[PDB]
Design a protein around this ligand. Structure first.
Ligand code: ARG
Length: 229
């Protein structure tokens, strides 16, 4: 079990794609910070070990996990059926819907998702995310442009090279304040979880127990309100 491996080695290795505010990012001193980071820290404490963060590109984050580059994904990861087939998820630690971001100027042209499903519309998303999937399914006439990082996608919409970007609601809000604008999607919210390799119920139970505990004893709420005020 990875649990044994973790405790022997003395360190918890957390796979994270660390340009994803407010879940995981660098502060002004290039230090790891965010909701997922604080949670990672809490879990490490529970485990009696130190934390090490393993920066990983989002698109390959599941393969990195499956090939043992780290023990656990804590990186704003939505639980999906397709992903459940590859890894195991903890109980939900959060919920996020899909939000559309546009230039304040172009806020007039865009009531909803449907308004983006035209052939002249370019929409930016992070590669390998639920936002990519949502756009590809629900905006098939549009031009979807993908990016390794959200920051570039943000940059594409500001520069005018894209008409919009789709991202998780809490990320969209965080990018808004940086004087661009949000338009909201009523269609679907989904739970986020932490991912681990299959065949490790000791670690899964431990994580779930730990999480359960933090929701019981106030520690989680303190942390939620800290990042989502
Ligand atoms: N750190 C990141 N880049 N996270 C992107 C996650 C986006 C979306 N919640 C998903 O799980 O697909």
């Amino acid at each position: 079990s990875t649990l044994d491996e973790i405790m022997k080695r003395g360190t918890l290795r957390v796979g994270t794609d660390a340009d994803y505010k407010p879940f995981s990012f660098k502060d002004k001193n290039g230090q790891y910070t965010g909701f997922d980071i604080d949670l990672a820290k809490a879990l490490a404490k529970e485990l009696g070990v130190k934390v090490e963060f393993v920066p990983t590109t989002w698109d390959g984050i599941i393969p990195a996990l499956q090939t043992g580059k780290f023990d656990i994904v804590m990186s704003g990861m939505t639980i999906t059926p397709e992903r459940k087939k590859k890894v195991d998820f903890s109980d939900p630690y959060m919920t996020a819907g899909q939000t559309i971001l546009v230039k304040k100027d172009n806020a007039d042209k865009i009531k909803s998702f449907e308004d983006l499903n035209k052939p002249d519309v370019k929409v930016a998303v992070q590669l390998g995310t639920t936002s990519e999937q949502a756009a590809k399914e629900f905006l098939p006439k549009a031009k979807i442009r993908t990016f390794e990082n959200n920051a570039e996608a943000f940059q594409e919409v500001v520069s005018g090279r894209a008409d919009a970007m789709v991202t998780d609601s809490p990320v969209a809000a965080y990018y808004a304040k940086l004087a661009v604008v949000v338009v909201d999607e009523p269609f679907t919210h989904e739970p986020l979880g932490f991912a681990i390799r299959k065949g490790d119920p000791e670690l899964l139970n431990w994580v779930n127990n730990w999480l359960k505990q933090m929701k019981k004893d106030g520690t989680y709420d303190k942390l939620y309100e800290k990042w989502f005020k």
